[PDB]
Every structure is written in C-alpha cells, then in structure tokens.
Amino acid sequence: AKHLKFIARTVMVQEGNVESAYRTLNRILTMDGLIEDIKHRRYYEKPCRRRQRESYERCRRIYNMEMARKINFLMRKNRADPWQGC
Amino acid sequence: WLIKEELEEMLVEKLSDLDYMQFIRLLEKLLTSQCGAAEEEFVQRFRRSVKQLIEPVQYDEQGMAFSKSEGKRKTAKAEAIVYKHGSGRIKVNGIDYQLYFPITQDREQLMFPFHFVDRLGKHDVTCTVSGGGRSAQAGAIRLAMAKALCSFVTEDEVEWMRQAGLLTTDPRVRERKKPGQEGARRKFTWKK
C-alpha cells in the first residue's frame, strides 16, 4: 500500500511470450513460498496443526535430502557389471 | 540357443531360469567377442540348428499341359485342374461358373487368384467341389485354383500369391457347441 507499485513481483515479458513470463513469475512466487503461503492462509491453520505440519515437512526434507545424497553417491555404481559371469 | 531343458540334460543338473539366462548372456558375449575356431568349436556345442511345393505339370491325352491341385475350406473340398492355355473358361462340377455361383461374391473369389497374377482369360479350369455351402465351396475352389496355377506362374509370382494369402488353407472351422451353454461361446442368460 505505502510502497511503490510495479516493482514487487513484477516480471517483464520477452518478445511477447506471456506464457514464459507467467511461468517465470510462478517460479518466483513458488520459490519465495508465496503460493504455499496463500494456499495455507485461505483457512486458519490452528497453531498445533501448523506445528505438526512444520515438523512433518522438516522430517520429510531431512529424509529426502539424505536419500538424494545416497542416490547421488551410489549413482556411479550403475556401471556395467565388470565381472560378468564370475 | 539350446533351451534350459537341453542345458539341464547336458549338465545332469537342475538349473533355474535366471541361471540359464546368465549362461546365455555369457555365451552371447563370447560369440560377440570375435570368437575364433578355438572358441567356436566350444560354442557350437550349445547351438541348435533350426516356399510353396509346386505341383508337377501333367499332360492330357491331347498333349495339352495342365496342373492338378486340391483345397479345402470349412467342409468343402475342391479338386481343380488348370490348363496351361485357355480362354478363361471355368467349369465347376460340369457347370459354367457364372451358373454354379450366381453370387457376385463367389465369382469374385474365383476371380481373385487369376486377377492377382494378371492371367485373366489365359487359363481354362475344371473344378469339382463337394461339401459345404456356396461360400465354402468358392473359397475351396479359389485355394485349389491358386495352387494349380502356381505350377504355371513364376516363383516370384508364387511367393507374391503366398504373401497375399492365396495359398494358405483357412483353418477357421465351426467351433463345437459346449454343454451347458447356448453355443460355442454364447452362454446361457445369467440369472443373478
């Protein structure tokens, strides 16, 4: 309200591909967490539910990051079997 | 490649599907790896080895050449004699074909072999067909005529006819009725 307009969350379309512009804007909002924040703020998430969801998301992120680390670590071992037959 | 049963028989041992697949993969690698005689002699121990029959051309009393063949469709059996030279006449059971087969579909079936090899009006045919209906008889005569004409067309034309399906004996025959149901596949109306 008290800020200048058309600076925040504004993207400029390149060569007229408004679809690309909207994809870029959507990526920006998603990465900044605005889309998820709006979806969650539609209805009031009581503090206990909010805490449980935050804890669940933290555990999910820890597990996913560790599993991704394991996958990237073992990806090299997807080579062709060197000792085939024996 | 020999089957798992053959490999088991050779090895007097019980193997598994995955063991057989492993061994076959290894043997294939050996084959690809520029296996010479010293290796091919071994490999071959595990290798297992894996066109229309033109009828002879006969001659009638008057010296005219012809070919005799037979073909069966459903319950219809047809014996067809095709002469080397003719004016396209086709006499079925002693009757002209347009009279025996008043149905355009059956006449078209008779036409199909000769028209395919571009020999309409070049051959005379005497056919004798017994059993079945009109369509079964027409199909049987078509097969017999095609087989007889194989003796007079070239090998490439014979192969083309085979690829067009003019020399295959249609194995589709009536399926027996089964007890407890209306027909071969029709089931009695279910009563929930």
Overall shape of chain A: flat
Approximate helicity band of chain A: 55-70%
Largest interface (C-beta under 8 Å): A-B, 2 and 4 residues
> Helical stretch count of chain B?
7
Whole-angstrom Rg of chain B: 26 Å
Order of helices and strands of chain B: HHHEEEEEHHEHH
Strand content of chain B: 15-25%
Distance between the termini of chain B: 52 Å
How many strands appear in the DSSP assignment of chain B? Answer: 6
Classify the beta-strand content of chain A into a percent band. Answer: under 5%
Order of helices and strands of chain A: HHH
Number of strands of chain A: 0
Helix-and-strand structural type of chain B: alpha+beta
Strand count, sense and closure of the main sheet of chain A? none
- Overall form of chain B: flat
Structure annotation, total helices of chain A = 3
Report the major sheet of chain B. Answer: 6 strands, mixed
What is the percent of helical residues of chain B? 25-40%
Q: Any idea what the radius of gyration of chain A is?
A: 22 Å
Largest beta sheet: strand ordering of chain B: 1-2-3-6-4-5
Oligomer: part of a larger assembly
PDB class: ribosome
Keywords: translation-initiation intermediate, ribosome
Entry title: Translation-initiation state of human mitochondrial ribosome small subunit (State D)
Chain A: Small ribosomal subunit protein bS21m
Folded structure, characterized:
- The structure is cut from a larger assembly and holds chains A (86 residues) and B (192 residues).
- With 86 residues, chain A is mainly alpha-helical.
- Chain A contains three helices and no strands.
- Chain A has helices at residues 18-32, 34-41, 47-74.
- The N and C termini of chain A lie far apart (73 Å).
- By secondary structure, chain B is an alpha+beta fold.
- Chain B is 39% helix and 16% strand.
- Chain B has seven helices and six strands; from the N terminus they run αααβββββααβαα.
- Chain B has helices spanning 4-11, 17-32, 37-43, 97-100, 104-116, 134-150, 155-164, and strands spanning 58-59, 65-73, 76-83, 90-92, 95-96, 125-130.
- Chain B starts with a helix and ends in a 28-residue tail after the last helix.
- Chain A binds chain B through residues 84-85, and chain B through 22, 25-26, 29.
- Chain A: Its main location: mitochondrion.
